[PDB]
Structure formats: structure tokens, C-alpha cells
Write a protein that binds this ligand. Structure first.
Ligand SMILES: O=Cc1cc2ccccc2[nH]1
Ligand SMILES: O=Cc1cc2ccccc2[nH]1
Lengths: 302, 302
């Protein structure tokens, strides 16, 4: 029993983190096969930060201008190119620790593990979710550019996120591993507002199912509700609408607990309208929305 | 910015996890140099669970009765011995991935990362703390026996915990890597009460300092307090007493924020007596006590 915000084991990703320096800027890079991936921020300086001319900055760079270090081992760059917001540095040595991997672009509401790195050295690992406004509420310091997010599916690493910048509000924005930003963000030092964030409804319902599985049952009421009636209440409290796709994905949890999805919606409906009255669910006084239905099944039943 | 319950990178520990089977029981093991460490629970069956005679059970075992598998590789056992509650299985092959390591016994209030493993395969990693009653609030399923807790200090893995059992209350108990249980627990299937748990005061204060560093300042009041007056209030709300050793360890955070430790105590004093009024600190509606002063410095300033 028990329930934690667990992250995937990071060993397969640790063996791929390198340090990338071009001129005077240093950040993290991802070394897969004979290619190092890193944000194109590495070819910038302070002066150009308001609106960098990335093409002109890269035209003036040679392969030798890129210093790539795997631990204490210098990798020789034998070619370079830019794809959207990331650079591909071709090196003469293939990473012997390359895991089976895929590049994926995730949807809002899905979760992934973040390996926070500095100077190519992993510092820590944590679990987070892609918010509906395409930001993440991570923990990054200066020098964390190039840190990657990922999921692990039975020895296959699915890379989904590379870290770029921190917004004035304290949230974070990044790209997929093909260089495209999640959300309407650009790698320039200009004020960029994130959209209004909402709560991931299907994740809260999955988290309530995990509570029932681990013995927290006080919030379950005796009522049911329709899908339309539930979505009307969810709209008032800034929750995402619940779709039949979401009801379908909650099926296995419903079968394990015997609680129909619309019955759990009736219980969430009361929680939204009346609050917790100082009580907690799985050790939290707030409703958690960073556990997918898949995350709940994995932790509650391997 | 941002603040997460971060765990250490697990790669150095993943390379040491093996599967240990003796007879019909299977659990996890820790493979360091030419020795595999695992709970002595592996030589038990259902019948003997109420009060296992561990010495008699081990006397009837040969080296060949122990099946140790590192991935798909079978390790040959060439010797065995029992030290307290763990077994040492000497194998003919040294683990080529053995990191620099130490065996440590931690104190209550200190934190460590847990690598949850099943059949010798890491499943996830999370951060937790040794409670004052010597339990941990982890997340384990059946088959998690032998999972280890650890800290990483610049390439040196300090192993501090090996998982054994789950109490009827849903909390977890284990041993150090020399086989001695944390707290008054025995590896038998008998009802064993944990002592009344308390809140780790110095960790809450460190977590409040992390809030100030990341911009949450609403709880800071205009008052100060003495150490004796603070401990009187902390006693009423089941908080550990604050010692001068704790005041000393909070020094660096006080210097960074300019807030004297006794001033932050005055602010915690008001929070304990009046509550949060529905507001949150670092995204939580409860006071968190699983971040040490060392954890806060690492995440807020690498
Ligand atoms: O990857 C690092 C990085 C990208 C970026 C864009 C704007 C401002 C700071 C930034 N850092
Ligand atoms: O390590 C696994 C393990 C030890 C133990 C003791 C009592 C009951 C169950 C147990 N599992």
C-alpha cells in the first residue's frame, strides 16, 4: 500500500547526458547513437537575447566551435544542423549506452519524469505533468537548459520534453525532441503569457480511485450523476470537461473498485461544491491531478 | 524556480539490483562487488511466517539452493552467511557496475530516495523520510522485499535502508544494510504497533525558507519568539522540539533570506495556532516536513 508521486528509474537517461559548450555558453545535451541533441540557445550570448538571429549565429559556427564532453571524455563534432529550436551535433563516437528509444510528442494531461541536469551531470529526478496551457510546474535552476523529460515502457525510453526557459510567472516551457515548442512559446527573452491553466479532471478521478484502493473512502457519497450534469459543475470550478474517452480509460479502475465512473463523478461533484472540511485524501488536503489512470494502475497493481 | 520533492538519480543503484530466489520465495537483492545482500525472508515459506526459525531454515540450505539472476545472467553462489536480518550471498562474479558506496545508518528526520524494485527490476523512484517512530511512508507492493533506500553524495552511494515489511497501518519498516531494523520491529508476521509519530520541526522550517526563496511570503508575520516559547507551542501540535543544533543547521537559509531562525519560528507559531485559511505554501495546503535543510539548499541553489 501507500501512494507516492513516483518517477521512472533514470539510469537509461543518465547514460545519455552530456555537456555542450559553444563559445561561452554551456548547457546540457542528449547523446543518442552518434548525435547530440541540445537547445539552440547554446549559440547565443547576452546581447542577442531579446531576439536572437539563430540562422546568422549558426552560420558563423564551425564544428570545432562546439565542445561536447561526456563525463571527462571530449567528443569530436563532425557536423551540425538546426531543426526548429534544437541543434543536432554529429559526433565521431556513438554512445555505447544508448537505450532503445523513441521521440514522442505528448498531449496535455499526460505525465512524464524529468531528469534535472547541470553541466551534463544529473542532479535529481521528479514526476510532473504537461499542463493544459502547455507549461510544466517543474524545478529548474540556471544551467538546466537541455534537461529532458521521458517515460519508460519496458526498456524503451520515450523522450517527450527538452527544457528551454522559465516564464516570469515561475512555470517552465520547452520543446519536443524535434525542436517544436509545446504551446505558443518562442525561445526569446520577451514577456510571454501562458494561457489560463485548468485542472485535469480525468487525473483527479483516477487519483480518487487510487484513494479507494488504498483505503480512503470517506468522500464517497450515495449519489450518481449524468455526464452533462457533472461537466456543468466542473466548468464552474475550472475543471476540464470529462469526455467518453476519459470514461473509457477509467474502466479498469471502476472494475477493480466496483464504483461506476459516473458515481465517482458524483463524489467529486460534492467535493468541488463543499470542500474537504480539513480532511485529507492520500495525505493531501488538495485534489491532485498529476496521476494518469495509467499511473494509478502501475503503482497500485504493478 | 519551482519546488518539487526530488529524488536522486537512480542509475548507480539500478546497476546493482538483482533477483534472489531460494526454494519458492523470490525478492530483490543488492549486488555489490562479489556479495549479494537480501532480506533473510527469502528462506521462509507461508507455514513458518508467524515466528520463523531463521537459523534452522538456513542450516538446511546449500549455496546451490540460492538462485541469483542479474538480468538474464545467473550468478553462481559460492558461499552464504546471515548477519542479523539480511543474508550475504557470495557469488563468483563481481558486479562490474559497482559504484563507490558506503553503508550508513540514518537518524529520524533524514531523507533518502527509494528505488522500488520487483523481480530484480527497478519500477520507480521516490523521495521519503525516516519518521520519528522509525517507519517510512513509502509505496510498496508484494514482491518489493529487498528494495533499497539511498543518498548520492557526488558519485558515492550511501545505502541506508532495505525494505522488509508493511505494518497493518499501511506504513513500512526495514533495516540498514547490516541487517538491523530501524525501530522496535522484527521480521515476523505478528501485530507490531509503531509509536506515535510526530512532525519533523526543523524540516518544516527549512521548507518555509524554501517558500520565501521561491516567492511565497504571505505567512511571514512581524513578530519574534524565544526558543522555549516556540517549543511550548510545538509540543501542543505534536511537533518535535527545536534544538540549538537545528537552529545551527538552518543558518545558511537564514543568511540567504535575512530571516532569523527565531523569526521564522514566530511565523510557524502563528501558522500552527491559526491555520492557513485555505491558502497554500509552495503548492501545498499542509505543512511539509520531508525536506531537510540540506535538501532545500540543493534544490534552491545547486
Ligand atoms: O535552453 C536554454 C534556454 C533557452 C532560452 C530562451 C530564452 C531565455 C533563456 C533560455 N535558456
Ligand atoms: O523482505 C520481505 C519480507 C520480510 C517480511 C517479514 C514479515 C512479513 C513479510 C515480510 N516480507
Amino acid at each position: 500500500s501507500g501512494f507516492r508521486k513516483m518517477a521512472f528509474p533514470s539510469g537509461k537517461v543518465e547514460g545519455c547526458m552530456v555537456q555542450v559548450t559553444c563559445g561561452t555558453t554551456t548547457l546540457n545535451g542528449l547523446w543518442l547513437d552518434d548525435v547530440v541533441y541540445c537547445p539552440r540557445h547554446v549559440i547565443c550570448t547576452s546581447e542577442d537575447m531579446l531576439n536572437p538571429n539563430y540562422e546568422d549565429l549558426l552560420i558563423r559556427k564551425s564544428n570545432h566551435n562546439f565542445l561536447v564532453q561526456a563525463g571527462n571524455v571530449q567528443l569530436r563534432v563532425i557536423g551540425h544542423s538546426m531543426q526548429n529550436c534544437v541543434l543536432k551535433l554529429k559526433v565521431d563516437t556513438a554512445n555505447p549506452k544508448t537505450p532503445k528509444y523513441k521521440f514522442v510528442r505528448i498531449q496535455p494531461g499526460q505525465t512524464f519524469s524529468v531528469l534535472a541536469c547541470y553541466n551534463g551531470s544529473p542532479s535529481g529526478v521528479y514526476q510532473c505533468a504537461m499542463r493544459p496551457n502547455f507549461t510544466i510546474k517543474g524545478s529548474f535552476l540556471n544551467g538546466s537548459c537541455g534537461s529532458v523529460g521521458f517515460n519508460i515502457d519496458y526498456d524503451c525510453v520515450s523522450f517527450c520534453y527538452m527544457h528551454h526557459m522559465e516564464l516570469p510567472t515561475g512555470v517552465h516551457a520547452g520543446t519536443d525532441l524535434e525542436g517544436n515548442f509545446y504551446g505558443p512559446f518562442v525561445d526569446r527573452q520577451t514577456a510571454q503569457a501562458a494561457g489560463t491553466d485548468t485542472t485535469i479532471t480525468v487525473n483527479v478521478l483516477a487519483w480518487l480511485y487510487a484513494a479507494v484502493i488504498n483505503g480512503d473512502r470517506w468522500f464517497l457519497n450515495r449519489f450518481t450523476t449524468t455526464l452533462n450534469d457533472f461537466n456543468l459543475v466542473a466548468m464552474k470550478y475550472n475543471y476540464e470537461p470529462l469526455t467518453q474517452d476519459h470514461v473509457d480509460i477509467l474502466g479498469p479502475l471502476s472494475a477493480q473498485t466496483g464504483i461506476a465512473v459516473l458515481d465517482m463523478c458524483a463524489s467529486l461533484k460534492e467535493l468541488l461544491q463543499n470542500g474537504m472540511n480539513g480532511r485529507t485524501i492520500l495525505g493531501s488536503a488538495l485534489l491532485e491531478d498529476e496521476f494518469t489512470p495509467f499511473d494509478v494502475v502501475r503503482q497500485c497493481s504493478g
